Specification:
Largest interface: A-B, 31 and 34 residues
Strand content of chain A: 5-15%
CATH class of chain A: Alpha Beta
Radius of gyration of chain A: 19 Å
Number of domains of chain A: 1
Shape of chain A: globular
GO biological process, one term (chains A, B): doxorubicin metabolic process
CATH topology of chain A: TIM Barrel
Organism (chains A, B): Homo sapiens
Pathway (chains A, B): Steroid metabolism
Oligomer: homodimer
Helix content of chain A: 25-40%
InterPro entries (chains A, B): AKR, AKR1C, Aldo/ket_reductase_CS, NADP_OxRdtase_dom, NADP_OxRdtase_dom_sf
Bound molecules: NADP nicotinamide-adenine-dinucleotide phosphate, 5alpha-androstan-3,17-dione, (3Beta,5alpha)-3-Hydroxyandrostan-17-one
EC number (chains A, B): 1.-.-.-, 1.1.1.112, 1.1.1.209, 1.1.1.53
CATH superfamily of chain A: NADP-dependent oxidoreductase domain
Number of strands of chain A: 10
Chain lengths: 325, 325
């Protein structure tokens, strides 16, 4: 249609530009990986320019192939795709960071990722098991200085393997640990965290904005709800009457209201869908705007509901969700 | 620059994209119209991608030479410049709209403008005089249905002469008159109006966002303060003590705080400067962010100061500033 050469982005603190709507690629293991290949191709056709994955999603072969397929048919150029990967917690030791990035890049068959994140701040012992456990099912925790992990991330950006580097699931204290590290070369460009109208992350968002860190929202639609990661008793975000009222007023959908909320408060928003219609629906976030009154109504929904506690990882001080923010 | 091929823009309701920081080109009458040439070149070199002018500014020859110079020297391509002109009030009759646009294009030596606006909703008699007057010195107003003016603007867009069309200095009533016009083809993409912390336009802004009309703020730095247009005893925006204290806290400037405020509330902001350092300074709006409490402090500065009343045009029903908004 009218002008597909341009799209909305935000300038990161390292000078790179991030598209403000990202396509989420995680799906529960029961969904065939074929659907990831299909869905990324559809997302790129629909106008997503930012694609979010991770080693632990076990889909980088498919996601990379979808990107390469869309480049080879002329649909998009590599410069106009912003691809994120993440370093899993079995590779936090500094000597394991670049090996893990190179392994992701070999799976993707890409030369570089646009963004590499520390996925989660609790370290687990190295090896092929992504969640290694003892005989009673308790995680095997590892002891790693994330400031040393971050210096290994910085060397990946100097090597050109990652254009930008950031973090995910960090709280205030862990962000200050990085920002205050002696000899810091690059600040994180982003903190990717759960964020939606039931857990709007006000306080953490303000801190990130005070440092020119972009907050990137995952579970912006209320999450995948996969058991046993998400409590099935938790409220379903998109049933909320305020979201539904706003959707009816705008002739949009609750999902669109939840995405647009994030864009207007300065957050970069992810959205996963493997459904062709809903992929195309989600790019309609650029076709309407919420009034101040509507933003205030959504701010009023905040209610302390964290879908993704990751509490199997609790105990070490780097477990990020016990602090206020 | 790390990546000067990307820059922050917003999608308009016609599918075109507008860069969110625009360069203002009006300068008071004591400044030679020639000075616009260098200023616009320096704006483009600094990273402005949106340049705002108008037939009545008497600078489109210079503005157009600057734009063509920076294309010819390889600094930017035409698709990375978003240029706005405006239809003066002696050309509101529908028969006269296209003629006026063609005259601006001949002066610019461009094939199209990216945006053509109705400059001000009060019509004056057609002819060479921009402010025609009778023998007693009274302005000669003209009775024109701006719906018919708008249909002529629609035809300019269909001809390709304007990629997008919008309005300026419209109030709620006048916007509604356009949006409710029978047989409307294209909504206005924007309403360019005075907007700054002393006149934050909340109500009109919300109305525009409810219709997916972008509000574009002029006089965002407190205006050119040219007599007789602006009263010299109006308060000087950039001396405001809250803006100055936020500037000192951020190691920025009061101008930068006023520009960033607008970006965060979803406004596209203009900034005129003919000073090389200030032009470069203003592009730093993309380098920092304001917290929610800082935004609320700036919201609290609102105080009903309209610098540009343009009351020479008061009397006709279309004069826009007698209604509440
Ligand atoms: N960094 C981390 O630790 C972390 C954690 C979680 C997620 N993430 C990233 O963020 C992404 C998004 O978060 P998420 O996977 O929790 O899910 P999400 O984006 O909050 O929601 C996905 C759910 O919403 C549905 N959906 C999507 N569009 C919809 C629409 N327009 N209307 C109604 N329902 C809609 C999806 O179903 P369909 O697919 O059937 O449309 C899926 O069931 C992930 O895929 C991943 O890339 C990161
Ligand atoms: N649609 C309309 O009816 C309408 C009305 C008015 C304006 N406009 C458009 O909006 C543009 C901007 O509005 P405006 O001309 O009233 O002025 P403005 O952008 O509010 O600026 C006022 C003044 O600020 C000074 N300045 C600029 N940057 C500065 C900085 N970083 N620190 C300190 N001072 C700074 C400039 O002086 P220096 O040049 O010396 O830096 C300028 O004179 C116009 O030029 C025009 O393009 C449209
Ligand atoms: C389920 C799965 C992904 C698939 C798998 O084989 C096991 C692994 C366990 C860890 C999970 C991960 C999905 C993404 C999750 C949910 C996180 O973001 C933190 C822990 C992650
Ligand atoms: C542009 C503007 C000067 C800046 C104001 O913000 C808007 C004014 C519109 C009317 C213009 C005027 C400059 C002087 C003009 C151009 C005239 O000579 C007669 C009409 C006058």
């Amino acid at each position: 249609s009218v002008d597909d050469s341009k799209y909305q982005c935000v300038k990161l603190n390292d000078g790179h530009f991030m598209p403000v709507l990202g396509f989420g690629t995680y799906a529960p293991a029961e969904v065939p990986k074929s659907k990831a290949l299909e869905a990324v191709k559809l997302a790129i056709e629909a106008g997503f320019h930012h694609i979010d994955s991770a080693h632990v999603y076990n889909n980088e072969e498919q996601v990379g192939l979808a990107i390469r397929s869309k480049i080879a048919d002329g649909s998009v150029k590599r410069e106009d795709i912003f691809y994120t990967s993440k370093l899993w917690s079995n590779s936090h030791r500094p000597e394991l960071v670049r090996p893990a990035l190179e392994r992701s890049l070999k799976n993707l068959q890409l030369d570089y990722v646009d963004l590499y994140l520390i996925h989660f701040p609790v370290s687990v012992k190295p090896g092929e098991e992504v969640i290694p456990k003892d005989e009673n099912g308790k995680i095997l925790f590892d002891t790693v200085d994330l400031c040393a992990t971050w210096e290994a991330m910085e060397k990946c950006k100097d090597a050109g393997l990652a254009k930008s580097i950031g973090v995910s699931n960090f709280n205030h204290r862990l962000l200050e640990m990085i920002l205050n590290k002696p000899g810091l070369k690059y600040k994180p460009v982003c903190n990717q965290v759960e964020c939606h109208p039931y857990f709007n992350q006000r306080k953490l968002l303000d801190f990130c904005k005070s440092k020119d860190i972009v907050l990137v929202a995952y579970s912006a639609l209320g999450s995948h709800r996969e058991e046993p990661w998400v409590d099935p008793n938790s409220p379903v975000l998109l049933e909320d009457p305020v979201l539904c009222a706003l959707a009816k007023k705008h002739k949009r959908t609750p999902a669109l209201i939840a995405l647009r909320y994030q864009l207007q408060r300065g957050v970069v928003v992810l959205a996963k869908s493997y459904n062709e219609q809903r992929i195309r629906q989600n790019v309609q976030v650029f076709e309407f705007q919420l009034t101040s009154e509507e933003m205030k109504a959504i701010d009023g929904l905040n209610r302390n509901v964290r879908y993704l506690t990751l509490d199997i990882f609790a105990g070490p001080p780097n477990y990020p969700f016990s602090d206020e923010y």
